[PDB]
Write an enzyme that holds these catalytic residues in place. Structure first.
Site, PDB file in Angstrom:
ATOM      1  CB  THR A  97      -1.276   0.076   1.491  1.00  0.00           C
ATOM      2  OG1 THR A  97      -1.650  -0.481   0.982  1.00  0.00           O
ATOM      3  CG2 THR A  97      -1.989   1.388   1.433  1.00  0.00           C
ATOM      4  CG  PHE A 130      -3.670   9.550   2.733  1.00  0.00           C
ATOM      5  CD1 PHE A 130      -2.867   8.342   3.637  1.00  0.00           C
ATOM      6  CD2 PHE A 130      -2.738  11.034   2.671  1.00  0.00           C
ATOM      7  CE1 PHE A 130      -1.439   8.693   2.747  1.00  0.00           C
ATOM      8  CE2 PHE A 130      -1.731  10.903   2.251  1.00  0.00           C
ATOM      9  CZ  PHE A 130      -1.029   9.559   2.528  1.00  0.00           C
ATOM     10  CB  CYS A 141      -4.239   7.465   6.288  1.00  0.00           C
ATOM     11  SG  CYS A 141      -2.811   6.669   6.429  1.00  0.00           S
TER      12      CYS A 141
HETATM   13  C1  MNH Z   1       0.594   5.742   0.824  1.00  0.00           C
HETATM   14  C2  MNH Z   1       0.294   4.578   2.033  1.00  0.00           C
HETATM   15  C3  MNH Z   1      -0.890   5.141   2.675  1.00  0.00           C
HETATM   16  C4  MNH Z   1      -2.510   5.330   1.894  1.00  0.00           C
HETATM   17  C5  MNH Z   1      -2.065   5.348   0.535  1.00  0.00           C
HETATM   18  C6  MNH Z   1      -3.257   4.806   3.392  1.00  0.00           C
HETATM   19  C7  MNH Z   1      -4.081   5.265   2.994  1.00  0.00           C
HETATM   20  C8  MNH Z   1      -5.696   5.511   3.893  1.00  0.00           C
HETATM   21  C9  MNH Z   1      -6.999   5.237   3.977  1.00  0.00           C
HETATM   22  C10 MNH Z   1      -7.650   5.733   1.919  1.00  0.00           C
HETATM   23  C11 MNH Z   1      -7.311   4.698   5.199  1.00  0.00           C
HETATM   24  C12 MNH Z   1      -8.974   4.940   5.274  1.00  0.00           C
HETATM   25  C13 MNH Z   1      -9.753   3.495   5.500  1.00  0.00           C
HETATM   26  C14 MNH Z   1     -11.406   3.254   5.007  1.00  0.00           C
HETATM   27  O1  MNH Z   1     -11.052   2.256   5.020  1.00  0.00           O
HETATM   28  O2  MNH Z   1     -11.536   4.646   5.110  1.00  0.00           O
HETATM   29  C15 MNH Z   1      -6.359   4.099   5.515  1.00  0.00           C
HETATM   30  C16 MNH Z   1      -6.400   3.969   7.158  1.00  0.00           C
HETATM   31  C17 MNH Z   1      -5.342   3.623   8.287  1.00  0.00           C
HETATM   32  N1  MNH Z   1      -4.646   3.373   7.648  1.00  0.00           N
HETATM   33 MN1  MNH Z   1      -3.495   4.812   5.698  1.00  0.00          MN
HETATM   34  N2  MNH Z   1      -1.684   4.053   6.135  1.00  0.00           N
HETATM   35  C18 MNH Z   1      -0.690   3.568   5.952  1.00  0.00           C
HETATM   36  C19 MNH Z   1      -0.192   4.050   4.959  1.00  0.00           C
HETATM   37  C20 MNH Z   1      -1.310   4.474   4.140  1.00  0.00           C
HETATM   38  N3  MNH Z   1      -2.449   4.540   3.788  1.00  0.00           N
HETATM   39  C21 MNH Z   1       0.763   3.310   6.836  1.00  0.00           C
HETATM   40  C22 MNH Z   1       2.483   3.663   6.668  1.00  0.00           C
HETATM   41  C23 MNH Z   1      -0.101   3.582   7.520  1.00  0.00           C
HETATM   42  C24 MNH Z   1       0.670   2.488   9.209  1.00  0.00           C
HETATM   43  C25 MNH Z   1       2.154   2.368   9.653  1.00  0.00           C
HETATM   44  C26 MNH Z   1      -1.020   2.796   8.063  1.00  0.00           C
HETATM   45  C27 MNH Z   1      -2.175   2.635   9.165  1.00  0.00           C
HETATM   46  C28 MNH Z   1      -4.056   3.227   8.781  1.00  0.00           C
HETATM   47  C29 MNH Z   1      -4.293   3.166  10.249  1.00  0.00           C
HETATM   48  C30 MNH Z   1      -4.402   2.717  11.283  1.00  0.00           C
HETATM   49  C31 MNH Z   1      -5.790   3.106   9.662  1.00  0.00           C
HETATM   50  C32 MNH Z   1      -7.229   3.404  10.037  1.00  0.00           C
HETATM   51  C33 MNH Z   1      -7.542   4.495  11.069  1.00  0.00           C
HETATM   52  C34 MNH Z   1      -8.086   4.465  11.940  1.00  0.00           C
HETATM   53  O3  MNH Z   1      -9.361   4.293  11.440  1.00  0.00           O
HETATM   54  O4  MNH Z   1      -8.376   4.638  13.415  1.00  0.00           O
HETATM   55  N4  MNH Z   1      -4.997   4.167   5.246  1.00  0.00           N
END
Ligand code: MNH
Ligand SMILES: CC(C)C1=CC2=CC[C@@H]3[C@](C)(CCC[C@@]3(C)C(=O)N[C@@H](Cc3c[nH]c4ccccc34)C(=O)O)[C@H]2CC1
Length: 453
Positions: free
Chosen positions: A266, A391, A398
């Site tokens: 991702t 995000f 995110c």
């Molecule tokens: C580029 C990189 C990248 C993208 C495009 C990204 C995109 C997303 C998106 C869109 C959502 C919302 C999902 C939903 O169902 O609504 C989300 C939720 C999340 N993400 Mn990130 N994510 C990361 C990298 C990304 N994440 C990294 C690196 C971490 C941790 C090390 C991470 C930890 C999360 C966590 C934890 C959530 C859930 C947050 C919550 O709901 O409290 N992430």
């Protein structure tokens, strides 16, 4: 009025439209045909796919809609449990983990992770410095080595040593096969024909492999009293200011598994798409390379220097606009409500936000939405609310956004300082869909500028 709907297959309704290797790209073409909203029906379920800023700005009103667990997230929950990503907002462990972890993922918290990120970024640069003249780079493979190793080392002081292997770590073998099984179960009509006992058997074995390494990581850390400034120390010591409770060891495991999923393809996808667009737009590459050379004047980049790579930040935002690597999220209606003055919804009704289509809304971005133009992000404040959502949204956004962008800015900065790039195959974009998106088979040649580390 009547909401548009794509072609139906008798009693199967729209279900067979997602019997495809590339369902996000299929839904994008359906959105191109049908416009800002379409109903998708299958036996026993109905969702609405949103593509316009006009409707998505209402979907993102947290008083009206909350995060839904899609079927995809429900299947991932079998191994990510009540971690932040696979939790309902109303689960006690969601709000606790959110309150405990959010301050440890801030822009300012990245100062503490910077040194560890530099350790892995230097390993990537040295790998490419050491290639022979006749060799090429497998871009997504190398970007995944970087992003996995970075979340392992900053997450819980664990070295996957991805630059020392062709064969994945056993944990990653199990995680990738478990993610594949979760995505495959989406298109799997009846999962009980005896062929699928072996899938189910392998699934339970991969869950056990993931639970076993991570539980051991947690147990080893609890024993040693070792106080590394990583996420695991933060989770063993931290107390939710609301409840006053810490996370229990089981929930900590699910958070670590969630971070390892997120930090894998991702996050590396962003770097793979960024380099793809840079080699396809040589004037943009030159402008990004001139910033990297002007700003990164020391053998290792400082935290402050990464924050000054404004154009590299714009390049990454423009890669997230065109190919957001977590390309959809799901919402449910908290109450009866009317969407866009025209589409009545009952409490519980589900929406799916199609982020790549939102990012191609011509009323927001202008006519040339397919062009890679980092200058769209000259002033990111100029972008209307809920127009750019790679995000996600609100309190369910995110948590890793600042981590992902710091990591990506640092390594892309160093790549543009240290190498000239050649699209030696004239690569034809082919986007492979898993839980994420990647430019499958993307390869380049890198020629050293011979600048020391
Ligand atoms: C580029 C990189 C990248 C993208 C495009 C990204 C995109 C997303 C998106 C869109 C959502 C919302 C999902 C939903 O169902 O609504 C989300 C939720 C999340 N993400 Mn990130 N994510 C990361 C990298 C990304 N994440 C990294 C690196 C971490 C941790 C090390 C991470 C930890 C999360 C966590 C934890 C959530 C859930 C947050 C919550 O709901 O409290 N992430
Ligand atoms: C784990 C995270 C990163 C992911 C989130 C996702 C959200 C939307 C998904 C996804 C992109 C995979 C392809 C199907 C799609 C677009 C979806 O609409 N799916 C709906 C509708 C659906 C498709 N098949 C189904 C079978 C049963 C029930 C619903 C469905 C859903 O999952 O709910 C998928 C990728 C993985």
């Amino acid at each position: 009025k009547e909401m548009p709907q794509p072609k139906t297959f008798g009693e199967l309704k729209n279900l067979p439209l997602l019997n495809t290797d590339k369902p996000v790209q299929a839904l994008m073409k359906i959105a191109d045909e049908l416009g800002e909203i379409f109903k998708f029906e299958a036996p026993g379920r109905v969702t609405r796919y949103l593509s316009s800023q006009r409707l998505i700005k209402e979907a993102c009103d947290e008083s009206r809609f909350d995060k839904n667990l899609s079927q995809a997230l429900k299947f991932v929950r079998d191994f990510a449990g009540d971690g932040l990503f696979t939790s309902w907002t109303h689960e006690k462990n969601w709000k606790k983990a959110h309150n405990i972890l959010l301050p440890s993922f801030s822009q300012q918290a990245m100062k503490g992770y910077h040194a560890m990120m530099v350790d892995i970024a230097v390993q990537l640069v040295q790998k490419w410095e050491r290639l022979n003249a006749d060799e090429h780079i497998e871009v997504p493979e190398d970007m995944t080595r970087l992003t996995l190793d970075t979340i392992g080392l900053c997450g819980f002081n664990y070295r996957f040593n991805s630059f020392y292997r062709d064969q994945p770590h056993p944990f990653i073998t199990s995680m990738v096969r478990a993610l594949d099984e979760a995505m495959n179960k989406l298109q799997r009509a009846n999962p009980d024909d005896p062929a699928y006992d072996e899938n189910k058997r392998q699934f339970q074995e991969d869950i056990k492999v993931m639970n076993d390494l991570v539980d051991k990581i947690i147990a080893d850390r609890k024993a040693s009293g070792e106080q590394s400034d990583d996420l695991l120390t933060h989770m063993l010591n931290g107390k939710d200011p609301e409840t006053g409770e810490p996370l229990d060891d089981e929930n900590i495991r699910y958070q670590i598994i969630t971070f390892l999923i997120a930090g894998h393809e991702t996050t590396s996808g962003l770097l793979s798409f960024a380099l793809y667009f840079l080699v396809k737009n040589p004037h943009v590459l030159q402008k990004a390379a001139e910033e990297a050379a002007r700003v990164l004047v020391d053998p290792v980049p400082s935290y402050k220097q990464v924050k000054q790579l404004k154009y590299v930040g714009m390049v990454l935002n423009e890669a997230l606009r065109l190919w957001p690597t977590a390309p959809a999220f799901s919402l449910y209606a908290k109450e009866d409500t009317v969407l866009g003055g025209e589409y009545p919804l009952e409490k519980g009704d589900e929406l799916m936000v199609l982020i790549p289509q939102l990012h191609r809304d011509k009323t927001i971005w202008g006519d040339d939405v397919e062009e890679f133009r980092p200058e769209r992000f000259e002033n990111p404040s100029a972008i209307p609310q809920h127009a750019f959502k790679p995000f996600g949204n609100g309190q369910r956004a995110c948590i890793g956004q600042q981590f992902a962008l710091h990591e990506a800015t640092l390594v892309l900065g160093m790549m543009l300082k240290h190498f000239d790039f050649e699209d030696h195959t004239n690569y034809e974009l082919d986007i492979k869909e898993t839980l994420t998106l990647k430019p499958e088979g993307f390869v380049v040649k890198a020629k050293s500028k011979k600048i020391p580390l």
